[PDB]
Amino acid sequence: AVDTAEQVYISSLALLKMLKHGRAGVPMEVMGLMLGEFVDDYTVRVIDVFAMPQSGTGVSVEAVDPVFQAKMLDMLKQTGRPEMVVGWYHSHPGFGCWLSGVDINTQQSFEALSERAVAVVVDPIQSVKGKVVIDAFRLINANMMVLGHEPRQTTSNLGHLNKPSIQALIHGLNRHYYSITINYRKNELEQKMLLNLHKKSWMEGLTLQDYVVKEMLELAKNYNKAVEEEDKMTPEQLAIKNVGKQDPKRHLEEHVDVLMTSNIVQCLAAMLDTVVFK
Template identity: 55%
Template sequence: MDQLLRGLLSQMAGGASLSARPKDDLHYPDTSETVKISALALLKMLKHARIGVPLEVMGLMLGEFVDDFTITVVDVFAMPQSGTSVSVESVDPAYQAKMLELLGRTSRKEMVVGWYHSHPGFGCWLSSVDQNTQQSFETLHKRAIAVVVDPIQSVKGKVVLEAFRLVQPGQLMSFSSFNPIRQHTSCIGHQSTAAAVAIIHGLGKKYYSLVCEYKITEREQGMLGKLHAKSWMDGFRLESQKSYDTSSIDSLVQMTKMANNFHKDLQEDATLTEEERIKQKKIKNFGKLNSKQRLEQVAERTMQDNIVKQLCAASCFHAMRRAELKNEGKKKDEVKKKEEVKNPLKSGVRIEKKEGKSKEDKSSASRSQSGWAWCTASETSKKKAKITVEDTMKSNSENSGVSSKSLKNLSVEKSKKSKKSKSKNEGKKK
């Protein structure tokens, strides 16, 4: 404002200076600065704004003031405040200081360059509440900016986002209605017309907009390109049975409809001559679906879905069958173990009675002569499996070739001797 007053006074003082052209001021406050927002910050702002719908959300932007013409926004973080166009919660300075301290530990040394908030569905402009909040930020730093994003109007390939700054009292003359906006001559940016809602709420009088650009590196571009990239496993994903039934019914309805339309087209073409076909070929299908092409697309899609469904169902059936067989085998093993624990003699005892040709048979025969049987079960079954002396004598007699009659004679003689010894002892006692 001081420069404008001095220029007017100088023109009033000298008549020669009236014909001189006024010099252009390169530092117009409405077009001199550019805000460069990184891809990471833009994604975070859009995600935070989409989550907060239908309420407004806010957060802080981190970056740096590179020079008098550029402001870079590297990262953002959300604040725990929400509100509407009429009321808004106050900013929590304790949370802000704690968050900046934690970000400093992660090598994030950038400073706060402004704040952002969302206007879900009603455009980008600053309300009276937003202007008061921006005024508090500009008291801390005069170049602080306010970014407004609309998550509902934003679509793929076009983000509805604008950056604003308040008009200071000394800048009112440069923002008068008769002063035109300085035009750009670079091929990088473009001049965007302001919305009527923003003009009604004070755009150009109470606050002005800044040019926003979105910078992206090669690595960030490759990373963003791989977010929605499909892998070979996506083709084997199965839908729920209800959605599969509805989609298959819809595809059948479309195929019948397109087949009827294609049949009608063939009948109409049969009645026309070649010249009429050439004339109507350019106009006939203009703005309409190509029934033949649409029929092929729907048929291919349904065939692919059915093939994938059958393959996945067959693989799932085989996997389930294998799991069932494994479970059955485990159950059988458990039952066998329980039976062995209950009846160890039935399951594990084995007595060797014959001399075998192998070394194992010879060793078992020698063990049987010593009075113990050979057990192939657990140690508990070995301890319990004892054989009486008579069984060992029988096995020894069979191995040595002694007949059963000799064993009876020996037992009779032993009984006679025992009776004689008893009678002698009784006589001595008498």
């Protein structure tokens, strides 16, 4: 029918299960499923993503056992709330992305079975805390080729989705595909608590247990002599003449902030007796 920009709200559990399931899916490109809710055409929130067992033949739709689904989701029937399987995912866990043939194996199968049927491409490599490395698309019919493929009613998100200058094989396969927007929805109760448990765990010291104070200053006066003489030897050879030559080699000597922050640490940790004591 008519087309309007589809939005993938993700559950953050889905983000965790993708990273974990592809992390365990070490090179061997695992398959799993997507289990969600039909809200409309132009959005989808996924609420649950669980695991599918490893098959060593070939990443296929024929490895999807439907009675495995029946039994697993049967256990999940009274457990919380079940919904429709709305898709699937495969993995390319070392390199970024491309539009696989596994897509054109199972995508026609799950667009026969389900309606939205979103393909999902994943990688864990490109960062550890600050990127969106997963990728997702959807197969286009051949029958819409009479229509020119340029309507879109809200072109901010296609002005944000075309905007990253799509990389290699996606627009190697612009045909048989059309892209889809994946934001991270409002997950603030988890966001604040992982912020807490990141600068409370993933940065050392559980704050009762920081207040190294002295042997670090033995090593730091080693620093504040060894760094110092090299801070001395160099700017003797600055432009002490009247030359108009303009070609620098750049080394940016300065060494200030090490001294500064380390010795603020040294003074306020020498404070620890008069601070924690009385």
